[PDB]
């Protein structure tokens, strides 16, 4: 089974090397493909209380085009400066605001933030919510193995 | 001051030994199997997260249990039940 499932893994790392490297290596690392091998680098932890989310994903200077992910401001330490950026996948901070898409009506999006989700409605902040607020479907196959009693 | 009476059948103790041996091995191996199964599921969740981005409809139909249509809402899926249609129509 493992020797079989590797065939899937070799493809998944091409889709998202970040998640694959974080899952296999064991540390939350940033990875990119270097041909037929994957290069990784450790990511710096940041406390959840040092991040602020901006209300609007639209660009006041660019009409028609607007961010697909929320803008955020984070500080590495309490005496550090304010560093701007945009939210990524699975509690990821992006320094470059290069995630641009044409703005479309009926824009309702959920994004992972902290321990829960943040919901934006027509490219504007709507509200925070918890993980349990959204119904969950399980990808796990249950195997209930019990021991022999003495 | 008392005299201890000994039973004439040691077979109960031998049965205890055999049962303990078999039970201990079985519990060890099944425990390892259970732990490995858990790690395998946690490991496959990563592949599921990416296949969800690739093709939301099939992943939603597989996980939910009903043929539904799904579309990503950022970091989560929105699903809707699909209406059956008979093949002869």
């Amino acid at each position: 089974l493992q020797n079989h499932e590797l065939t899937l893994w070799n493809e998944a790392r091409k889709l998202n090397p970040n998640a694959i490297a974080s899952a296999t290596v064991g540390r939350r690392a940033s990875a990119r493909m270097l041909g037929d091998v994957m290069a990784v680098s450790t990511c710096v932890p940041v406390a959840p209380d040092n991040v602020i989310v901006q209300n609007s994903m639209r660009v006041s200077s660019r009409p028609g085009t607007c961010y697909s992910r929320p803008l955020v401001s984070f500080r590495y330490e309490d005496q550090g400066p304010l560093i701007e950026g945009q939210l990524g996948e699975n509690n990821e901070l992006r320094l470059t605001r290069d995630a641009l898409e044409p703005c479309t009506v009926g824009h309702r999006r959920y994004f992972i933030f902290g321990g829960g989700y943040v919901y934006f409605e027509e490219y504007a902040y709507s509200h925070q919510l918890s993980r349990a607020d959204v119904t969950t479907v399980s990808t796990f196959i249950d195997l209930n193995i019990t021991m022999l009693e003495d | 001051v008392e005299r201890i009476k000994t039973t004439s059948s040691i077979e109960f103790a031998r049965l205890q030994f055999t049962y303990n041996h078999i039970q201990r091995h079985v519990n060890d191996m099944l425990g390892r199997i259970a732990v490995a199964w858990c790690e395998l599921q946690n490991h496959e969740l990563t592949l599921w997260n990416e296949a969800r981005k690739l093709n939301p409809n099939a992943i939603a139909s597989a996980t939910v249990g009903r043929r539904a249509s799904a579309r990503m809402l950022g970091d989560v899926m929105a699903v809707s039940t699909c209406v059956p249609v008979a093949p002869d129509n």
Binding site: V134, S138, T139 | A60, M77, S80, C82
Partner: peptide, 20 residues
Amino acid sequence: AQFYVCPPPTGATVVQFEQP
């Protein structure tokens, strides 16, 4: 041997994956 027609998904119903 049965077909399904799927209306476009809406934000009314939202499901996520169970965490490890």
